Amino acid sequence: AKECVITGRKSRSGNKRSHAMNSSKRTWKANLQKVRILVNGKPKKVWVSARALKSGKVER
Template sequence: MARKDNLTNRGPLSGSSRSHAMNSNKRKWNLNLQKVKVMDENGKILSVKVSARTLRTLKKHNQLAK
Protein backbone atom coordinates (compact mmCIF):
# COMPACT_ATOMS: atom_id res chain seq x y z
CA MET A 1 0.00 0.00 0.00
CA ALA A 2 2.65 2.50 -0.98
CA ARG A 3 1.82 6.17 -1.56
CA LYS A 4 -1.71 5.96 -0.16
CA ASP A 5 -3.43 7.92 2.57
CA ASN A 6 -4.34 5.39 5.27
CA LEU A 7 -7.44 7.27 6.42
CA THR A 8 -9.02 8.47 3.17
CA ASN A 9 -7.51 5.90 0.73
CA ARG A 10 -6.48 8.67 -1.65
CA GLY A 11 -3.72 7.69 -4.06
CA PRO A 12 -1.56 9.42 -6.63
CA LEU A 13 -3.12 11.10 -9.66
CA SER A 14 -1.90 10.49 -13.19
CA GLY A 15 -1.92 12.63 -16.28
CA SER A 16 0.28 14.13 -18.97
CA SER A 17 2.98 16.75 -18.84
CA ARG A 18 2.88 18.92 -21.94
CA SER A 19 5.83 20.71 -23.52
CA HIS A 20 5.58 24.04 -25.31
CA ALA A 21 5.40 22.05 -28.57
CA MET A 22 2.47 20.07 -27.07
CA ASN A 23 4.50 16.85 -26.80
CA SER A 24 2.94 14.54 -24.23
CA ASN A 25 4.62 12.48 -21.51
CA LYS A 26 2.91 10.43 -18.83
CA ARG A 27 3.52 11.68 -15.30
CA LYS A 28 2.25 11.15 -11.77
CA TRP A 29 1.32 13.57 -8.97
CA ASN A 30 2.14 11.90 -5.66
CA LEU A 31 0.53 12.79 -2.35
CA ASN A 32 2.39 14.78 0.28
CA LEU A 33 2.41 11.97 2.87
CA GLN A 34 3.21 12.64 6.53
CA LYS A 35 3.60 10.20 9.42
CA VAL A 36 1.38 11.14 12.37
CA LYS A 37 -0.01 9.55 15.52
CA VAL A 38 -3.80 9.42 15.69
CA MET A 39 -6.09 8.36 18.52
CA ASP A 40 -8.88 5.94 17.56
CA GLU A 41 -12.34 5.58 19.17
CA ASN A 42 -11.01 3.35 21.96
CA GLY A 43 -8.27 5.81 22.93
CA LYS A 44 -5.56 3.69 21.30
CA ILE A 45 -2.71 5.58 19.60
CA LEU A 46 -1.94 4.50 16.02
CA SER A 47 0.86 5.65 13.72
CA VAL A 48 -0.50 6.26 10.22
CA LYS A 49 0.54 7.93 6.97
CA VAL A 50 -1.83 10.69 5.91
CA SER A 51 -1.74 13.36 3.24
CA ALA A 52 -1.06 16.97 4.19
CA ARG A 53 -4.67 17.88 3.44
CA THR A 54 -5.98 15.14 5.75
CA LEU A 55 -3.53 16.29 8.42
CA ARG A 56 -5.02 19.78 8.21
CA THR A 57 -8.49 18.35 8.75
CA LEU A 58 -7.31 16.25 11.71
CA LYS A 59 -5.78 19.35 13.32
CA LYS A 60 -9.02 21.26 12.77
CA HIS A 61 -11.05 18.58 14.58
CA ASN A 62 -8.44 17.91 17.33
CA GLN A 63 -7.99 14.23 16.39
CA LEU A 64 -4.19 14.07 16.71
CA ALA A 65 -2.55 12.29 19.65
CA LYS A 66 -0.26 14.42 21.77
Template structure:
Protein backbone atom coordinates in the same frame (compact mmCIF):
# COMPACT_ATOMS: atom_id res chain seq x y z
CA UNK B 1 3.40 0.05 1.02
CA UNK B 2 1.32 1.94 -1.50
CA UNK B 3 1.16 5.72 -1.64
CA UNK B 4 -2.33 5.98 -0.24
CA UNK B 5 -3.88 7.87 2.66
CA UNK B 6 -5.14 5.35 5.22
CA UNK B 7 -7.88 7.74 6.38
CA UNK B 8 -9.37 9.17 3.17
CA UNK B 9 -8.10 6.71 0.56
CA UNK B 10 -6.55 9.51 -1.51
CA UNK B 11 -3.86 8.11 -3.84
CA UNK B 12 -1.59 8.96 -6.77
CA UNK B 13 -3.05 10.80 -9.78
CA UNK B 14 -1.64 10.38 -13.27
CA UNK B 15 -1.76 12.50 -16.39
CA UNK B 16 0.34 14.12 -19.08
CA UNK B 17 3.31 16.44 -18.78
CA UNK B 18 3.08 18.97 -21.61
CA UNK B 19 6.07 20.73 -23.13
CA UNK B 20 5.95 24.09 -24.91
CA UNK B 21 5.55 22.17 -28.20
CA UNK B 22 2.58 20.32 -26.63
CA UNK B 23 4.43 16.98 -26.60
CA UNK B 24 2.81 14.62 -24.10
CA UNK B 25 4.66 12.31 -21.72
CA UNK B 26 3.15 10.53 -18.75
CA UNK B 27 3.72 11.79 -15.21
CA UNK B 28 2.39 11.29 -11.67
CA UNK B 29 1.15 13.61 -8.96
CA UNK B 30 2.02 11.98 -5.64
CA UNK B 31 0.03 12.52 -2.48
CA UNK B 32 1.75 14.47 0.30
CA UNK B 33 1.80 11.71 2.93
CA UNK B 34 2.99 12.19 6.48
CA UNK B 35 3.51 9.53 9.15
CA UNK B 36 1.53 10.63 12.20
CA UNK B 37 0.81 9.09 15.59
CA UNK B 38 -2.97 8.96 16.05
CA UNK B 39 -5.02 7.59 18.92
CA UNK B 40 -7.47 5.00 17.57
CA UNK B 41 -9.72 3.15 20.04
CA UNK B 42 -7.52 4.17 22.95
CA UNK B 43 -4.30 2.92 21.32
CA UNK B 44 -1.65 5.10 19.69
CA UNK B 45 -0.86 3.93 16.14
CA UNK B 46 1.38 5.24 13.39
CA UNK B 47 -0.70 6.10 10.33
CA UNK B 48 0.23 7.46 6.91
CA UNK B 49 -2.19 10.26 6.10
CA UNK B 50 -2.38 13.10 3.63
CA UNK B 51 -1.70 16.61 4.83
CA UNK B 52 -5.23 17.62 3.82
CA UNK B 53 -6.70 14.94 6.13
CA UNK B 54 -4.29 15.99 8.88
CA UNK B 55 -5.45 19.62 8.61
CA UNK B 56 -9.09 18.50 8.75
CA UNK B 57 -8.50 16.40 11.89
CA UNK B 58 -6.65 19.26 13.58
CA UNK B 59 -9.41 21.71 12.68
CA UNK B 60 -12.12 19.42 14.09
CA UNK B 61 -9.90 18.67 17.13
CA UNK B 62 -10.16 14.89 16.82
Protein backbone atom coordinates in the same frame (compact mmCIF):
# COMPACT_ATOMS: atom_id res chain seq x y z
CA ALA C 1 -0.39 0.65 0.81
CA LYS C 2 0.99 4.19 0.61
CA GLU C 3 -2.32 6.00 0.98
CA CYS C 4 -4.12 8.19 3.49
CA VAL C 5 -5.95 6.13 6.12
CA ILE C 6 -8.86 8.60 6.46
CA THR C 7 -9.59 10.01 2.99
CA GLY C 8 -7.88 7.35 0.93
CA ARG C 9 -6.22 9.60 -1.61
CA LYS C 10 -3.08 8.29 -3.29
CA SER C 11 -1.04 8.40 -6.48
CA ARG C 12 -2.76 9.05 -9.80
CA SER C 13 -1.44 9.33 -13.35
CA GLY C 14 -1.52 11.96 -16.07
CA ASN C 15 0.36 13.67 -18.86
CA LYS C 16 3.31 16.07 -18.80
CA ARG C 17 3.32 18.77 -21.47
CA SER C 18 5.68 21.35 -22.95
CA HIS C 19 5.80 23.98 -25.65
CA ALA C 20 4.93 22.19 -28.91
CA MET C 21 2.70 20.07 -26.62
CA ASN C 22 4.90 16.97 -26.60
CA SER C 23 3.15 14.56 -24.25
CA SER C 24 5.16 12.59 -21.69
CA LYS C 25 3.84 10.47 -18.84
CA ARG C 26 4.04 11.38 -15.14
CA THR C 27 2.17 10.92 -11.86
CA TRP C 28 0.57 12.96 -9.07
CA LYS C 29 1.43 11.95 -5.51
CA ALA C 30 -0.50 12.89 -2.38
CA ASN C 31 0.97 14.99 0.42
CA LEU C 32 1.25 12.01 2.74
CA GLN C 33 2.95 12.57 6.11
CA LYS C 34 3.75 9.86 8.66
CA VAL C 35 2.14 10.74 12.01
CA ARG C 36 1.13 8.94 15.20
CA ILE C 37 -2.65 9.06 15.73
CA LEU C 38 -5.21 6.94 17.57
CA VAL C 39 -6.33 4.83 14.62
CA ASN C 40 -7.76 2.31 17.11
CA GLY C 41 -7.94 1.87 20.87
CA LYS C 42 -4.15 2.32 20.74
CA PRO C 43 -1.99 4.83 18.84
CA LYS C 44 -0.04 3.88 15.73
CA LYS C 45 2.05 5.47 12.98
CA VAL C 46 0.19 5.69 9.66
CA TRP C 47 0.19 7.69 6.43
CA VAL C 48 -2.08 10.74 6.69
CA SER C 49 -2.38 13.46 4.07
CA ALA C 50 -1.72 17.10 4.94
CA ARG C 51 -5.30 18.03 4.01
CA ALA C 52 -7.07 15.47 6.21
CA LEU C 53 -4.83 16.77 9.02
CA LYS C 54 -5.87 20.43 9.30
CA SER C 55 -9.31 20.29 10.97
CA GLY C 56 -9.87 17.71 13.68
CA LYS C 57 -7.41 14.83 14.07
CA VAL C 58 -5.51 13.37 17.04
CA GLU C 59 -2.11 14.14 18.63
CA ARG C 60 -0.25 14.09 15.29
